[PDB]
Each structure stands twice: as C-alpha cells, then as structure tokens.
Write a protein that binds this ligand. Structure first.
Ligand SMILES: Cc1cccc(Cl)c1Nc1c([C@H]2CC[C@H](NC(=O)CCl)CC2)nc2ccccn12
Ligand SMILES: Cc1cccc(Cl)c1Nc1c([C@H]2CC[C@H](NC(=O)CCl)CC2)nc2ccccn12
Ligand SMILES: [Ca+2]
Ligand SMILES: [Ca+2]
Ligand SMILES: [Ca+2]
Ligand SMILES: [Ca+2]
Ligand SMILES: [Ca+2]
Ligand SMILES: [Ca+2]
Ligand SMILES: [Cl-]
Ligand SMILES: [Cl-]
Lengths: 236, 5, 236, 5
C-alpha cells in the first residue's frame, strides 16, 4: 500500500520516532506498512503495533463516549430539538472507529494469526482480536451485535486456553489477557459474577507463582496484578 | 471505567 | 470544498461538539468550511476558528521539536550513523505543519482580513496572521527565512497600531497580541530587550486601567497580565 | 518555552 516503497527496517525506525513524538496515527500507519511486508513480527515489533492502535482507538472511544452522552441528553424529556447534527457527528466518529477496528482485525486475519505458532505470539494476537471485537461491540446496536460479542468471546477464549496450557500464571501477556477478558464479561457480556471470579482466580494463581521470579519480572507481574485488584475493588 | 491493557 | 454541502449553522454546531470531544482536526475542518461560506465571523465564531487551529498546530510544533532534537543529537560528534530516516520524518511533520499554517493564512487572505472593519475583528485576524507566520519562521532555514520573519513582524505591527488607537490597554485581544509580539521579539527576531520592554510597558499600562473594569473583565485582563509577568520572570 | 495565547 502507501508504505509499499519504504524499507521494513525504516518503517520500524519511524514507528519508534512517532511514538517519541506522540504521533500515534503516523505510528499506526508505519506499523501497518511493516505488517504488510509479510514477515512475522518480533516481540518488540508486536508491542509497537499494539501501542500505536491502542492510542488511536483509545482517542476515538473517548470522543465517541462524549458525543453519545450529549446525544442521550438530547433525547430526554424537556430537551429542545437541535436537529440531526449531534447524531450525524456521533455517527461520523463511530464510522471512523469501526474503520480502525476493521483495519486491525484485517491485519490479524491477513496473516498474523495464522503464522503465529509460539504461544507468546499467538496469545498476543488473539487478545488483540478479542479487544478490537470488544471495541466494535461497545458501539453496536443492530442485528449483528450478538455475533460481534460472540466473535470477541471466541477469540478471548482461544487465547485463554493456550495461555493456561503454555504460559506461567505470572506471565504478563496471560495476566493482561485475563484482565481484559474479565472486563469483557463485566461491561459487554452482562456477566459481572464471571468477571469477578476470573479476576480473583487470576490474581490468586499469580500470587502463588511470584516466588519463582527475578526482581524485574516480579515488578512487571505485580503491576498488572494491581490492575486486577483495582477492578475487583471497583466491582465489590 | 475499569482498567484494561 | 469538502464542507460545501453542509449548512453554515450546522458546521458551527459541529465545531462546538468537536471541541467538547477534543477532536481538534475535525473542529478545524468544520470552521474552515464555515469561513468558506463567505460571511463574516462573529466573536464567538472567531474564537472557535482560533482554538481549533491553535490546538492542531500546537501538536505539530511539539512533535517537530521532539524530532528536531533527535536529529540534532544524531549530528553530534561520536553519534553512530542511522541513515536518512530521522531527517525524512522530521521533514514529513514539518511539511504538514507548513500546510496547516498556509491553510490558516489562506483563510485570512481570502477574505477575512479585507472584510474586517471593526478594531476587535481586524486586530484578532492580524494577530493570527503574525502568529502563523511566526510558526513558519520557527521551522524556516532557507532563502526566505528573512521574508517570513518580516511578514510576521508586519502583521503584528499593524495589529499593534490599531489596538493602541482603538482599544483600552486592558482589552484581552490587545494584551494577548502584545504578549505574542513580545515572544516574537525574544524567540524569533533576536531582540530580547525589545521583548522585555514591550511586556513591561504593556503590563504597566494595563495595571493603571484596571480600576475602570467590572469584576468579570478584571478577571479576564489580570489572567493575561500574569502571563506577561511570567515571561518577564523567565527573561530577567 | 514562553507563554503565548
Ligand atoms: C500491551 C500488553 C499486551 C498484553 C498484556 C499486557 Cl500486560 C500488555 N501491557 C503491559 C505489558 C506488556 C506485556 C507484553 C510485552 N510484549 C511481549 O512480551 C512481546 C510488552 C509489555 N507490560 C505491562 C506492565 C504493566 C501494565 C501493562 N503492561
Ligand atoms: C485566543 C486569544 C486571542 C487573542 C487574545 C487572547 Cl488573550 C486570547 N486568549 C484569551 C482570551 C480570549 C480573548 C478574545 C475573546 N474573543 C473575542 O473577544 C471575540 C475570547 C477569549 N481570554 C483569555 C483569558 C486568559 C488567557 C488567554 N485568553
Ligand atoms: Ca527490503
Ligand atoms: Ca453507525
Ligand atoms: Ca510462525
Ligand atoms: Ca444555507
Ligand atoms: Ca522542509
Ligand atoms: Ca465588515
Ligand atoms: Cl458530521
Ligand atoms: Cl517519513
């Protein structure tokens, strides 16, 4: 595509520069270009890909929430009619968000997931698949909402099955997957009890494995464990 | 909103 | 252009929504569309225009500074050669920034300034002209740098002449113009003494006129006076 | 950087 003429290594280098400059749209475009070279991604490169799109979609989600709240208020009793503009602009932002999600899901399907054989890579990409279907579910209101939710669930579940077989309970990818799948249960699937159970079991199994870790690995795992605890505190 | 990574 | 089919009032409404959602690129595009309808802008509409572009160009300037610093370090003694990528990406961001400045200057020239007869509107637009030429000067390194600096100076000077004749010394537009022209002197024109003199004289003349103001006007003027004081403290 | 508005 647009980045077809730039070297893979140059795209990676520029993604890192874009991150330093907080230019996340550029970062995402560079990493899309790097994926489309067709080679597998290293650990570092996978994290550049995820950081870039997380920041782009994160801004879109925040904007969508603002606009949705204004729209909800416009449709309350006693609200004066202001015309189609709030709905139109919310729809514009929504369409852009859906486009970013479709872009990410497209990269995963063509062909990151199918070439990922190691547990660390495969779980990482399946977590991404679940996350981006979750973002589509957040804005879905139509005939496909159930199918979108089931697509998220299925991706998370495959990732969980691999992670439990192949990774220690303190592995950061495994922990972050569980954190996000727990949020899926609470916020998307209307299953708060499942969310709470998953967060608690994950935390406790990680606690019991901390003794095996170096100082630096301990720091990484305990950071994510604290996010599990934070959600449990929010929900209980 | 709850924490995700 | 792109917004040619949308009502003027709808563009204004959506600019306000975009501001609430912190979608400043969208805000700027809506306000560009509103300007291109050909009617003069109200006070409120002028401030939507300035806020939108200030935020867009502000992000570009911050990114440019990050990339320029990396590039400067790459060209120091003992630095390992990393190829053309840092320069290329700095150039990309620079070109985008220059494009935004050219867009704003184009709106001012076609035809906001020529139709602005009231002091408040004319000074507001001439301040913008000076500011956007100043942003072009920040990145200029070639045969036109002197001409760009002189274009900024000329716009600021016309604005200052009108403001001194037609506005009280506490007027926020007059104060903000003086603040920015003082920064032009310090950072662009290599004239720190002129910068300091202008900030001090502006502050002192405003101080002497505060007694004439309502509580709310006093608040507005004193806020900007504090920025003058902050710059003086930085420079002395 | 100095303050501008
Ligand atoms: C982005 C993400 C995806 C999955 C899981 C998590 Cl937990 C995070 N976030 C995150 C990390 C990651 C862990 C994966 C590392 N990459 C490789 O092994 C290849 C990169 C670092 N560390 C932390 C630490 C604290 C909070 C979140 N983290
Ligand atoms: C954006 C700008 C341009 C010019 C000068 C200033 Cl000082 C600012 N910023 C700013 C303001 C403005 C003053 C002009 C108002 N618009 C109309 O009269 C038409 C809008 C509000 N108030 C303050 C207060 C504190 C700091 C900066 N301000
Ligand atoms: Ca190559
Ligand atoms: Ca829609
Ligand atoms: Ca493989
Ligand atoms: Ca009309
Ligand atoms: Ca250039
Ligand atoms: Ca006029
Ligand atoms: Cl729209
Ligand atoms: Cl580039």
């Amino acid at each position: 595509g647009a980045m077809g003429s730039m070297e893979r290594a140059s795209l990676i280098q520029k993604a890192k520069l874009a991150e330093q400059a907080e230019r996340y749209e550029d970062m995402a475009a560079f990493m899309k270009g790097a994926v489309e070279k067709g080679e597998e991604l290293s650990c570092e490169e996978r994290n550049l890909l995820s950081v870039a799109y997380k920041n782009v979609v994160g801004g879109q989600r925040a904007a969508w929430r603002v606009l949705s709240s204004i729209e909800q208020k416009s449709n309350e009793e006693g609200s004066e009619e202001k015309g189609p503009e709030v709905r139109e602009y919310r729809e514009k932002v929504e369409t852009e968000l859906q486009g970013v999600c479709d872009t990410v899901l497209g990269l995963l399907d063509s062909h990151l997931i199918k070439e990922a054989g190691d547990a660390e890579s495969r779980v990482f990409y399946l977590k991404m698949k679940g996350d981006y279907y979750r973002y589509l579910a957040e804005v879905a209101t139509g005939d496909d909402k159930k199918r979108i939710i089931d697509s998220a669930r299925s991706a998370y579940q495959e990732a969980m099955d691999i992670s439990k077989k192949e990774m220690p309970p303190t592995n950061p990818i495994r922990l972050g997957l569980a954190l996000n799948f727990s949020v899926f249960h609470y916020e998307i699937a209307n299953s708060p009890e499942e969310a709470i159970s998953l967060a608690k079991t994950t935390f406790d199994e990680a606690m019991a494995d901390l003794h095996t870790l170096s100082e630096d690995s301990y720091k990484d795992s305990t950071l994510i464990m604290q996010l599990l605890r934070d959600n449990l505190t929010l929900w209980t | 909103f709850p924490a995700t990574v």
